[PDB]
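Customer escalation, tier 2.

The customer says the design service returned an amino acid string that "doesn't look like it belongs to this structure." They asked us to rerun it and document both sides in this ticket. The original structure tokens are below, unchanged.
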């Protein structure tokens, strides 16, 4: 067919019941994740084409960047809890990969402060059990699919996107093929 199992996507041999509808994993240390988010805008373009009612989840992972990697998973939890993902995603990516000015948990906190989150509110969230349960959700979801690389996208805990089987000569055309493929998988 046009969309072949084992070509533009693969099927999980062990489907994950109760998984989010569209689930993306990334790391702020991940160079291809920087491309996906900062240059290609994959998440946003997948969104604009998802059928009505289908929600998108994006989680950070621990297996890159050591201690600071784990701090970023907790920071991403804070972002989700405060609903400020769209305010901190760019300066966190640029802080880790462009300026290389993020070297500690305090440097991460500075990004939120600069983005207008009050220090007391960031600190309260950072230490909150609501944030600890969000960190757990991120770890569990990665574990549910035995995740060992990013970027990665899963649909209905059944299907994993396979972008390596795609032409990347034109960035726009690649992004829309990626998005149209998620839409297809969503309708399966």
């Amino acid at each position: 067919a046009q969309y072949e199992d084992g070509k533009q996507y693969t099927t999980l041999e062990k489907p994950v019941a109760g998984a989010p509808q569209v689930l993306e994993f990334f790391s702020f240390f991940c160079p291809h994740c920087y491309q996906f988010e900062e240059v290609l805008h994959i998440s946003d373009n997948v969104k604009k084409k998802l059928p009505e009612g289908v929600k998108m989840t994006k989680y950070h992972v621990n297996f890159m960047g050591g201690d600071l990697g784990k701090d970023l998973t907790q920071a991403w939890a804070v972002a989700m809890a405060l609903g400020v993902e769209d305010k901190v995603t760019v300066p966190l990516f640029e802080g880790v990969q462009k300026t290389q000015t993020i070297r500690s948990a305090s440097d991460i906190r500075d990004v939120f402060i600069n983005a207008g989150i009050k220090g007391e509110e960031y600190d309260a969230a950072w230490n909150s059990f609501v944030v600890k349960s969000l960190v757990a959700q991120q770890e569990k979801a990665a574990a549910d699919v035995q995740l060992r690389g990013v970027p990665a996208m899963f649909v209905n805990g059944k299907y994993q996107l396979n972008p390596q089987g795609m032409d990347t000569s034109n960035m726009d055309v690649f992004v829309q093929q990626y998005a149209d493929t998620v839409k297809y998988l969503s309708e399966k």
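Tier 2 assessment: The sequence is consistent with the input. The first helix runs from residue 31 to 39. Helices lie at 31-39, 42-47, 66-82, 85-98, 105-114, 119-126, 129-144, 171-187. Sent an explanation to the customer and offered a walkthrough call.
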